[PDB]
Curated annotation (Swiss-Prot), chain A:
Name the record gives this protein: Actin-binding protein WASF1
Modifications the protein undergoes after translation, according to the UniProt entry: Phosphorylated on tyrosine residues by ABL1 and dephosphorylated by PTPN12.
Binding partners and assembly: Component of the WAVE1 complex composed of ABI2, CYFIP1 or CYFIP2, BRK1, NCKAP1 and WASF1/WAVE1. Within the complex, a heterodimer containing NCKAP1 and CYFIP1 interacts with a heterotrimer formed by WAVE1, ABI2 and BRK1. CYFIP2 binds to activated RAC1 which causes the complex to dissociate, releasing activated WASF1. The complex can also be activated by NCK1. Binds actin and the Arp2/3 complex. Interacts with BAIAP2. Interacts with SHANK3; the interaction mediates the association of SHANK3 with the WAVE1 complex. Interacts with ABI1 (via N-terminus).
Family: Belongs to the SCAR/WAVE family.
Regions crossing the membrane: none
Disorder cited: Neurodevelopmental disorder with absent language and variable seizures: A disorder characterized by neurodevelopmental abnormalities, including moderate to profound intellectual disability, with autistic features, seizures, severe impairments in speech, and gross motor delay.
UniProtKB/Swiss-Prot annotation, chain B:
Name of this chain's protein: Cytoplasmic FMR1-interacting protein 1
Cellular localisation: Cytoplasm; Cytoplasm, Perinuclear region; Cell projection, Lamellipodium; Cell projection, Ruffle
Additional free-text comment from the UniProt record: Breakpoint hotspot for the Prader-Willi/Angelman syndromes and may be implicated in autism. Commonly altered in tumors.
Family statement drawn from the similarity comment of this UniProt entry: Belongs to the CYFIP family.
Species of provenance: Homo sapiens (Human)
Function comment: Component of the CYFIP1-EIF4E-FMR1 complex which binds to the mRNA cap and mediates translational repression. In the CYFIP1-EIF4E-FMR1 complex this subunit is an adapter between EIF4E and FMR1. Promotes the translation repression activity of FMR1 in brain probably by mediating its association with EIF4E and mRNA. Regulates formation of membrane ruffles and lamellipodia. Plays a role in axon outgrowth. Binds to F-actin but not to RNA. Part of the WAVE complex that regulates actin filament reorganization via its interaction with the Arp2/3 complex.
Superkingdom field: Eukaryota
Range covered out of full length: 785 to 862 of 1253
Subunit structure: Component of the WAVE1 complex composed of ABI2, CYFIP1 or CYFIP2, BRK1, NCKAP1 and WASF1/WAVE1. Within the complex, a heterodimer containing NCKAP1 and CYFIP1 interacts with a heterotrimer formed by WAVE1, ABI2 and BRK1. Component of the CYFIP1-EIF4E-FMR1 complex which is composed of CYFIP, EIF4E and FMR1. Interacts with FMR1 but does not bind to related proteins FXR1 or FXR2. Interaction with EIF4E stimulates FMR1 binding. Component of the WAVE2 complex composed of ABI1, CYFIP1/SRA1, NCKAP1/NAP1 (NCKAP1l/HEM1 in hematopoietic cells) and WASF2/WAVE2.
Length: 54, 78
């Protein structure tokens, strides 16, 4: 149990760092910097969620 | 994809099917944990990382090609 829970502690700590970075990044967005691409552009890499089945 | 393979009149079918999917997600979320239906819909519509999704692109494509040059209006019935 201790070994397993220690792994979760590492995962939680890593997530905490990511959230702190995102919060700093999201509180800096400038609305004037937003730009939109052409209507006929589909070259953007479609986002795919993780699908790992044990 | 099914909507993308038919004319603009399939919008009602897409909305009905989407409502069914949303309700199924709500039923499954009672006992399981799942991502929000909005996030999954955006993921399937390629809208999370892009300003415009697939549905709007198809609507524009249909308007330019089929709807505009193959439909006659009637103001009496709108």
């Amino acid at each position: 149990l201790f070994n397993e829970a220690h792994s979760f502690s590492f995962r939680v700590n890593s997530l905490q760092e990511r959230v702190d970075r995102l919060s700093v990044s999201v509180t800096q967005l400038d609305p004037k910097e937003e730009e939109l691409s052409l209507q006929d552009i589909t070259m953007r890499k479609a986002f795919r969620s993780s699908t790992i089945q044990d | 994809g099914r909507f993308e393979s038919e004319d603009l009149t399939s919008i009602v079918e897409l909305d009905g099917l989407l409502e069914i999917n949303r309700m199924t997600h709500k039923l499954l979320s009672r006992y399981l944990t799942l991502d929000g239906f909005d996030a999954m819909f955006r993921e399937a519509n390629h809208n999370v990382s892009a300003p415009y999704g697939r549905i709007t692109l198809h609507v524009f494509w249909e308007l330019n090609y089929d709807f505009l040059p193959n439909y006659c209006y009637n103001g009496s019935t709108n």
